[PDB]
Coordinates of C-alpha atoms and ligand atoms in Angstrom, one line a residue:
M1 CA 20.4 5.1 -17.2
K2 CA 21.0 5.1 -13.5
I3 CA 18.1 5.1 -11.1
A4 CA 18.0 5.7 -7.3
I5 CA 15.2 5.0 -4.8
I6 CA 15.0 6.7 -1.5
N7 CA 12.4 6.3 1.3
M8 CA 11.6 9.9 2.3
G9 CA 10.5 9.1 5.9
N10 CA 11.6 5.7 7.0
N11 CA 15.0 4.0 7.4
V12 CA 15.6 1.2 4.8
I13 CA 17.1 -2.2 5.7
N14 CA 15.7 -5.7 6.2
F15 CA 12.0 -6.3 6.3
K16 CA 11.0 -5.1 9.8
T17 CA 8.2 -2.7 8.6
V18 CA 5.8 -2.1 5.8
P19 CA 7.6 1.0 4.5
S20 CA 11.1 -0.6 4.6
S21 CA 9.7 -3.9 3.1
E22 CA 7.8 -2.2 0.3
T23 CA 10.9 -0.1 -0.5
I24 CA 13.0 -3.3 -0.9
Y25 CA 10.2 -5.0 -2.9
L26 CA 9.8 -1.9 -5.2
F27 CA 13.6 -1.9 -5.6
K28 CA 13.4 -5.6 -6.5
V29 CA 10.6 -5.3 -9.0
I30 CA 12.3 -2.3 -10.6
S31 CA 15.5 -4.3 -10.9
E32 CA 13.6 -7.2 -12.4
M33 CA 12.6 -4.7 -15.2
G34 CA 16.2 -4.7 -16.3
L35 CA 16.9 -1.3 -14.8
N36 CA 20.1 -0.2 -13.0
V37 CA 18.9 0.9 -9.6
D38 CA 20.3 1.7 -6.1
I39 CA 18.5 2.3 -2.8
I40 CA 20.0 5.2 -0.9
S41 CA 19.5 5.3 2.8
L42 CA 21.2 6.2 6.1
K43 CA 23.7 3.3 6.0
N44 CA 25.5 1.0 3.5
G45 CA 24.2 -2.6 3.6
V46 CA 23.3 -5.6 1.4
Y47 CA 20.4 -3.6 -0.1
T48 CA 21.5 0.0 0.4
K49 CA 24.2 2.6 -0.1
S50 CA 24.5 5.6 2.3
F51 CA 23.7 9.2 1.4
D52 CA 27.3 9.9 2.3
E53 CA 28.8 7.4 -0.2
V54 CA 27.0 8.6 -3.3
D55 CA 26.6 11.7 -5.5
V56 CA 22.9 12.3 -5.9
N57 CA 23.5 13.9 -9.3
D58 CA 25.2 10.8 -10.7
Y59 CA 21.6 9.4 -11.0
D60 CA 19.5 10.1 -14.0
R61 CA 16.2 9.4 -12.2
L62 CA 15.4 9.8 -8.5
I63 CA 12.4 7.9 -7.2
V64 CA 11.1 8.8 -3.7
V65 CA 8.7 6.9 -1.4
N66 CA 7.1 7.2 2.0
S67 CA 6.9 10.8 3.2
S68 CA 6.7 10.6 7.0
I69 CA 6.9 14.4 7.5
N70 CA 3.2 14.8 7.9
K71 CA 8.4 15.3 14.1
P72 CA 11.3 15.0 11.6
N73 CA 13.9 12.2 12.2
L74 CA 17.3 11.3 10.9
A75 CA 15.9 9.5 7.9
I76 CA 13.6 12.5 6.9
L77 CA 16.3 15.1 7.3
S78 CA 18.9 13.1 5.4
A79 CA 16.4 12.4 2.6
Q80 CA 15.4 16.1 2.5
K81 CA 19.0 17.3 2.3
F82 CA 19.8 14.6 -0.4
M83 CA 16.8 15.7 -2.5
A84 CA 17.7 19.3 -1.9
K85 CA 21.0 18.9 -3.8
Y86 CA 19.5 17.0 -6.7
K87 CA 19.1 19.2 -9.8
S88 CA 16.6 17.1 -11.7
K89 CA 13.0 16.0 -11.4
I90 CA 11.9 13.9 -8.5
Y91 CA 9.4 11.0 -9.1
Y92 CA 7.3 10.6 -6.0
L93 CA 5.4 7.3 -5.6
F94 CA 2.1 8.3 -3.9
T95 CA 1.0 5.0 -2.5
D96 CA -0.7 6.3 0.7
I97 CA -3.3 9.1 0.6
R98 CA -2.2 10.4 4.0
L99 CA 1.4 10.6 2.9
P100 CA 1.6 13.2 0.1
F101 CA 4.9 14.8 -0.7
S102 CA 5.8 17.6 1.6
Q103 CA 8.9 19.5 2.7
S104 CA 10.0 19.5 6.3
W105 CA 11.4 23.0 5.9
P106 CA 8.2 24.5 7.3
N107 CA 8.2 21.9 10.1
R108 CA 11.4 23.0 16.1
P109 CA 14.3 22.9 18.6
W110 CA 16.7 20.8 16.6
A111 CA 16.2 23.3 13.8
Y112 CA 19.5 24.6 15.1
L113 CA 21.4 21.9 13.3
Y114 CA 19.9 22.6 9.9
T115 CA 19.4 25.6 7.5
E116 CA 16.6 26.4 5.0
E117 CA 18.4 26.0 1.6
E118 CA 20.1 22.9 3.0
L119 CA 16.6 21.3 3.2
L120 CA 14.7 23.3 0.6
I121 CA 13.8 21.1 -2.4
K122 CA 13.5 23.2 -5.5
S123 CA 13.3 20.4 -8.1
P124 CA 10.0 19.9 -9.9
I125 CA 8.0 17.0 -8.6
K126 CA 6.1 14.3 -10.5
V127 CA 3.5 12.6 -8.4
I128 CA 2.9 9.1 -9.6
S129 CA -0.5 8.4 -8.1
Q130 CA -1.4 4.9 -7.2
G131 CA -5.0 6.2 -7.4
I132 CA -6.8 6.8 -10.7
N133 CA -8.4 10.0 -9.5
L134 CA -5.8 12.7 -10.0
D135 CA -8.0 15.5 -8.5
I136 CA -7.6 13.7 -5.2
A137 CA -3.9 13.5 -5.6
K138 CA -3.8 17.2 -6.5
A139 CA -5.9 18.1 -3.4
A140 CA -3.5 16.1 -1.2
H141 CA -0.5 18.1 -2.6
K142 CA -2.2 21.5 -2.7
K143 CA 0.2 22.8 -0.1
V144 CA 3.2 22.0 -2.4
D145 CA 4.7 25.1 -3.9
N146 CA 7.0 23.2 -6.2
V147 CA 6.4 22.9 -9.9
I148 CA 4.3 19.7 -10.0
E149 CA 2.6 17.3 -12.3
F150 CA 0.6 14.1 -11.8
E151 CA 0.1 10.7 -13.5
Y152 CA -1.7 7.5 -12.5
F153 CA 0.2 4.2 -12.3
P154 CA -1.0 1.1 -10.4
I155 CA 2.2 0.9 -8.3
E156 CA 0.7 -1.7 -6.0
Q157 CA 0.7 -4.4 -8.7
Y158 CA 4.4 -5.0 -7.9
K159 CA 3.2 -7.9 -5.6
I160 CA 1.8 -9.9 -8.5
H161 CA 4.4 -9.0 -11.1
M162 CA 7.3 -10.1 -8.9
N163 CA 9.2 -13.0 -10.5
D164 CA 8.5 -15.3 -7.5
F165 CA 4.8 -14.7 -7.3
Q166 CA 2.5 -17.7 -6.6
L167 CA -1.2 -18.1 -5.8
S168 CA -1.9 -19.5 -2.3
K169 CA -3.0 -23.2 -2.3
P170 CA -6.1 -24.8 -0.6
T171 CA -5.7 -24.3 3.1
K172 CA -7.6 -25.8 6.1
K173 CA -10.1 -23.3 7.4
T174 CA -10.1 -22.2 11.0
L175 CA -11.6 -18.7 10.6
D176 CA -14.7 -17.2 9.0
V177 CA -13.3 -13.7 8.1
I178 CA -9.9 -12.2 8.4
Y179 CA -8.4 -8.7 8.0
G180 CA -4.8 -7.7 8.2
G181 CA -3.7 -4.2 8.7
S182 CA -3.3 -1.2 11.1
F183 CA -5.8 1.0 12.9
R184 CA -4.5 3.9 10.8
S185 CA -5.3 6.6 13.4
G186 CA -9.0 5.5 13.4
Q187 CA -9.5 6.8 9.9
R188 CA -11.5 3.6 9.2
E189 CA -12.9 2.9 12.6
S190 CA -16.5 3.1 11.5
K191 CA -16.1 0.6 8.6
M192 CA -14.0 -1.7 10.8
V193 CA -16.7 -1.8 13.5
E194 CA -19.4 -2.2 10.8
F195 CA -17.8 -5.2 9.2
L196 CA -15.6 -6.8 11.8
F197 CA -17.4 -6.3 15.1
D198 CA -20.6 -7.9 16.5
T199 CA -21.0 -10.2 13.4
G200 CA -21.4 -13.4 15.5
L201 CA -18.8 -14.8 13.2
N202 CA -15.3 -16.1 13.9
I203 CA -13.2 -13.1 12.9
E204 CA -9.5 -12.2 13.3
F205 CA -7.8 -8.8 12.8
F206 CA -4.0 -9.3 12.4
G207 CA -1.5 -6.5 12.3
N208 CA -0.8 -3.4 14.4
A209 CA -4.4 -2.9 15.6
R210 CA -5.5 -3.5 19.2
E211 CA -9.0 -3.7 20.7
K212 CA -8.2 -0.7 23.0
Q213 CA -7.9 1.6 20.0
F214 CA -11.5 1.2 19.2
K215 CA -13.0 3.6 21.7
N216 CA -14.8 6.2 19.7
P217 CA -18.3 6.4 21.2
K218 CA -19.7 7.3 17.8
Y219 CA -19.2 3.7 16.7
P220 CA -20.7 1.4 19.4
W221 CA -20.0 -2.3 19.6
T222 CA -20.3 -5.2 22.1
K223 CA -18.0 -7.9 20.9
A224 CA -14.8 -7.4 19.0
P225 CA -12.8 -9.7 16.7
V226 CA -9.7 -11.4 18.0
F227 CA -6.6 -9.2 17.5
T228 CA -3.3 -11.0 16.7
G229 CA 0.3 -9.7 16.1
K230 CA 2.0 -8.4 13.1
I231 CA 3.5 -10.8 10.6
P232 CA 6.0 -10.4 7.6
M233 CA 4.6 -8.9 4.4
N234 CA 5.6 -12.0 2.5
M235 CA 3.3 -14.0 4.8
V236 CA 0.1 -12.0 4.5
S237 CA -1.5 -14.0 1.7
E238 CA -0.7 -17.3 3.5
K239 CA -2.2 -15.8 6.7
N240 CA -5.4 -14.6 4.8
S241 CA -5.7 -18.2 3.5
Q242 CA -6.7 -19.5 7.0
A243 CA -10.1 -17.9 6.5
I244 CA -13.2 -18.6 4.4
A245 CA -13.2 -14.9 3.4
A246 CA -10.9 -11.9 3.6
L247 CA -12.2 -8.3 3.7
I248 CA -11.4 -5.2 1.8
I249 CA -13.0 -2.1 3.3
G250 CA -13.7 1.4 2.0
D251 CA -11.9 4.6 2.9
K252 CA -12.9 8.1 1.7
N253 CA -10.4 9.2 -0.9
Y254 CA -9.5 5.6 -1.5
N255 CA -12.9 4.6 -2.7
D256 CA -13.3 4.4 -6.5
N257 CA -9.7 5.6 -6.7
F258 CA -7.0 3.4 -5.2
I259 CA -6.5 -0.3 -5.6
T260 CA -4.5 -1.3 -2.6
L261 CA -1.9 -4.0 -2.0
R262 CA -4.5 -5.7 0.1
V263 CA -6.7 -6.3 -3.0
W264 CA -3.9 -8.4 -4.5
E265 CA -2.8 -10.1 -1.3
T266 CA -6.5 -11.1 -0.8
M267 CA -7.2 -12.1 -4.4
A268 CA -4.1 -14.3 -4.5
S269 CA -5.0 -16.0 -1.2
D270 CA -7.2 -19.1 -0.6
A271 CA -9.7 -16.8 1.1
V272 CA -12.6 -15.5 -1.0
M273 CA -12.2 -11.7 -1.5
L274 CA -15.2 -9.8 -0.2
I275 CA -15.3 -6.1 -1.0
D276 CA -17.1 -3.2 0.7
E277 CA -19.4 -1.9 -2.1
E278 CA -18.4 1.7 -1.3
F279 CA -14.7 1.0 -2.1
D280 CA -15.4 0.0 -5.7
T281 CA -19.0 1.0 -6.7
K282 CA -18.4 0.3 -10.4
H283 CA -17.0 -3.1 -9.7
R284 CA -13.7 -2.5 -11.5
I285 CA -11.9 -5.2 -9.4
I286 CA -14.3 -8.0 -10.3
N287 CA -17.5 -7.6 -12.4
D288 CA -19.4 -10.0 -10.2
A289 CA -21.8 -8.8 -7.5
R290 CA -21.2 -11.9 -5.4
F291 CA -17.8 -10.5 -4.3
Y292 CA -19.4 -7.3 -2.9
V293 CA -21.2 -6.5 0.4
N294 CA -22.8 -3.2 1.4
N295 CA -23.0 -3.7 5.2
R296 CA -22.6 -6.1 8.1
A297 CA -25.9 -8.0 7.4
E298 CA -24.8 -8.8 3.9
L299 CA -21.3 -9.8 5.0
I300 CA -22.8 -12.3 7.5
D301 CA -25.1 -13.8 4.9
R302 CA -22.4 -14.0 2.3
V303 CA -19.9 -15.8 4.6
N304 CA -22.7 -18.2 5.7
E305 CA -23.4 -18.9 2.0
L306 CA -19.7 -19.6 1.4
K307 CA -19.6 -21.9 4.5
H308 CA -22.7 -23.8 3.3
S309 CA -21.6 -24.3 -0.3
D310 CA -18.1 -25.5 -1.0
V311 CA -19.1 -25.3 -4.7
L312 CA -19.8 -21.6 -4.4
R313 CA -16.6 -21.0 -2.4
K314 CA -14.4 -22.9 -4.8
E315 CA -16.0 -21.2 -7.8
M316 CA -15.4 -17.7 -6.4
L317 CA -11.8 -18.6 -5.6
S318 CA -11.3 -19.8 -9.1
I319 CA -12.8 -16.6 -10.5
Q320 CA -10.7 -14.2 -8.4
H321 CA -7.5 -16.2 -9.2
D322 CA -8.4 -16.1 -12.9
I323 CA -8.9 -12.3 -12.7
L324 CA -5.6 -11.9 -10.9
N325 CA -3.9 -13.9 -13.6
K326 CA -5.4 -11.8 -16.4
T327 CA -3.6 -8.8 -14.9
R328 CA -0.4 -10.8 -14.4
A329 CA -0.6 -11.5 -18.1
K330 CA 0.0 -7.8 -18.7
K331 CA 3.3 -7.6 -16.9
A332 CA 5.2 -6.3 -19.9
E333 CA 2.7 -3.6 -20.5
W334 CA 2.9 -2.7 -16.8
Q335 CA 6.7 -2.6 -16.9
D336 CA 6.6 -0.4 -20.0
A337 CA 4.1 1.9 -18.4
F338 CA 6.3 2.4 -15.3
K339 CA 9.3 3.2 -17.5
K340 CA 7.3 5.8 -19.4
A341 CA 6.1 7.2 -16.0
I342 CA 9.7 7.9 -15.0
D343 CA 10.4 9.4 -18.5
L344 CA 12.4 6.4 -19.9
Ligands
UPG401 O1 0.5 -8.2 10.1 C1 0.5 -7.6 9.1 C2 -0.6 -6.8 8.6 C3 -0.5 -6.1 7.4 N1 0.7 -6.1 6.7 C4 0.8 -5.3 5.5 O2 0.3 -4.0 5.7 C5 -0.3 -3.5 4.5 C6 -1.0 -2.2 4.7 O3 -2.1 -2.4 5.5 P1 -2.8 -1.2 6.3 O4 -1.7 -0.7 7.2 O5 -4.1 -1.6 6.9 O6 -3.0 0.0 5.2 P2 -3.8 0.0 3.8 O7 -4.5 1.3 3.7 O8 -4.5 -1.3 3.7 O9 -2.6 0.0 2.7 C7 -1.6 1.0 2.6 O10 -0.3 0.4 2.3 C8 -0.4 -0.4 1.0 C9 1.0 -0.9 0.8 O11 2.0 0.0 1.0 C10 -0.8 0.6 -0.1 O12 -1.0 -0.2 -1.3 C11 -2.1 1.3 0.2 O13 -2.5 2.2 -0.8 C12 -2.0 2.0 1.6 O14 -3.2 2.7 1.9 C13 -1.0 -4.7 4.0 O15 -1.4 -4.7 2.6 C14 0.0 -5.8 4.3 O16 0.9 -6.0 3.2 C15 1.8 -6.7 7.1 O17 2.9 -6.7 6.5 N2 1.7 -7.4 8.3

């Protein structure tokens, strides 16, 4: 059994970006399962083989991640051409709602260098949805003409199942609330302004976001949180640990559907995980109302309660860490489920 992993829209090497980093980490966790796997990208390196140095059909299973299509680039075109020659099923890891599988064929001046068939992917596609709601996954891929099927798998748990995983340790607190991520084209501007702006608390937003991006008049604010630079993925939990609490906010289509990497990065940290009620209305993450907040007013009060009671804060950290460990205890089941998902 030979497996291949390819990032459909981003070059893969080192850990200079979320897509490239997640690809290497997914590659690593799949290898740790006792599976023979290669990462195929633009160039040969310590973690990858080039498209030009391998025969796509020598692989029994082809896993694909990150579809950047929805202005094609070298990575996208090379991936498309590679997938186009593969004669078997493609297993697409749907980890970001905005990035469903799609062919660049429809998507140009440079079109002169490529032909249709050369990029037309005819293989059936199995969408492995990180989200439990498959109707949402189907809707996101409604434009796909390929034969296609769907199945749910909590892909994002690769963080906690990695062999080197460790909970964050008690850390000196210099922040009230922290959130690490990107602006994501303002798709979450309303929630970000609700929970992170004008709270009167000491809040930090780390990652790609900048204050100048929050300019939609529909979501007014007076004072913004402090924005700091991007840091390595393997430093996110340590960064979250500088704060009393770390926030998880809702997103239409993600709500009551996706559990995101952030959930685990936050749960594993020394910061109490506070969740926007709308993101998990049934409290699947933690069956404890103390970890949920409906709006800004509730977030402020909850953070103040945590600051006033070290007992409450430590108790909640103990609870979230325990819950995280209960999931880590199911590693073998998780590994078996992934294997079944890719027909092994
Ligand atoms: O300085 C920073 C800030 C954030 N991150 C990472 O970026 C990830 C993604 O954050 P963001 O860009 O805000 O997007 P999310 O919607 O929170 O997460 C997306 O990316 C996750 C990991 O690929 C998936 O689990 C989610 O489903 C997908 O929506 C975080 O989890 C962190 O791992 C960094 O590496 N450095």
